[PDB]
C-alpha cells in the first residue's frame, strides 16, 4: 500500500527494469524528459506503459499545489504525471502574485484543480472508469 502521497516513483521503475530487462542494450531513463531525439522517447515510452500497470491509479494525473494570489490561497496544477511520460514539472511557476491578467486568469479557470478541489466526493457503480468528483 503505497502511501497516498507518494507520486514520485522512480528508483522503483528503474529497479524493476534492472531486475528484469537487465541485458537490454540501450539506456533507459524513466522520466522521458531526459530523452533525446524522439526515438529515444519511444524506446522509453514503452517501458513506462508497462511498469505503469503495477503502481496505483490514484497517484496518476495532475500534481496540484497551493499558491497565493495576493495573500489568498489557491490550488493550481503545477505539473503532471502521465502513465508513460514519467514526471513532468512546469517551468514558469510563480507564487505570491497580486493582480493576474487575462491570460493566466483564463489558464486558471480551465484547470480541474480548482474545480474538483472543491466538490462533493463521488462514487459511481454504473461504470468502471475511475470516477473522481
Amino acid at each position: 500500500k503505497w502511501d497516498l502521497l507518494k507520486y514520485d516513483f522512480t528508483e522503483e521503475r528503474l529497479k524493476l527494469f534492472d531486475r528484469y530487462f537487465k541485458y537490454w542494450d540501450q539506456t533507459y531513463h524513466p522520466n522521458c524528459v531526459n530523452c533525446l531525439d524522439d526515438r529515444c522517447i519511444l524506446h522509453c515510452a514503452n517501458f513506462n506503459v508497462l511498469f505503469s500497470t503495477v503502481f496505483p491509479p490514484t497517484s496518476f494525473g495532475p500534481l496540484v499545489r497551493k499558491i497565493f494570489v495576493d495573500g489568498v490561497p489557491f490550488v493550481v496544477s503545477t505539473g503532471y504525471h502521465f502513465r508513460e511520460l514519467g514526471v513532468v514539472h512546469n517551468q514558469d511557476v510563480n507564487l505570491h502574485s497580486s493582480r493576474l491578467s487575462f491570460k493566466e486568469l483564463l489558464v486558471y479557470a480551465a484547470d480541474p484543480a480548482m474545480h474538483a478541489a472543491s466538490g462533493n466526493l463521488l462514487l459511481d457503480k454504473r461504470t468502471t472508469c475511475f470516477s473522481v468528483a
Binding site: 490550488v75 487575462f102 486568469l105 483564463l106 486558471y108 479557470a109 480548482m114 478541489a117 472543491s118
Partner: peptide
C-alpha cells in the same frame, strides 16, 4: 464584453474558492 467576461470569471473563481480552505 471582454470586461464583462473578466468580471464573471473572477467572481465564479472566488465563489468556488471560499468553500475549500
Amino acid at each position: 464584453k471582454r470586461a464583462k467576461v473578466t468580471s464573471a470569471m473572477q467572481t465564479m473563481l472566488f465563489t468556488m474558492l471560499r468553500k475549500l480552505d
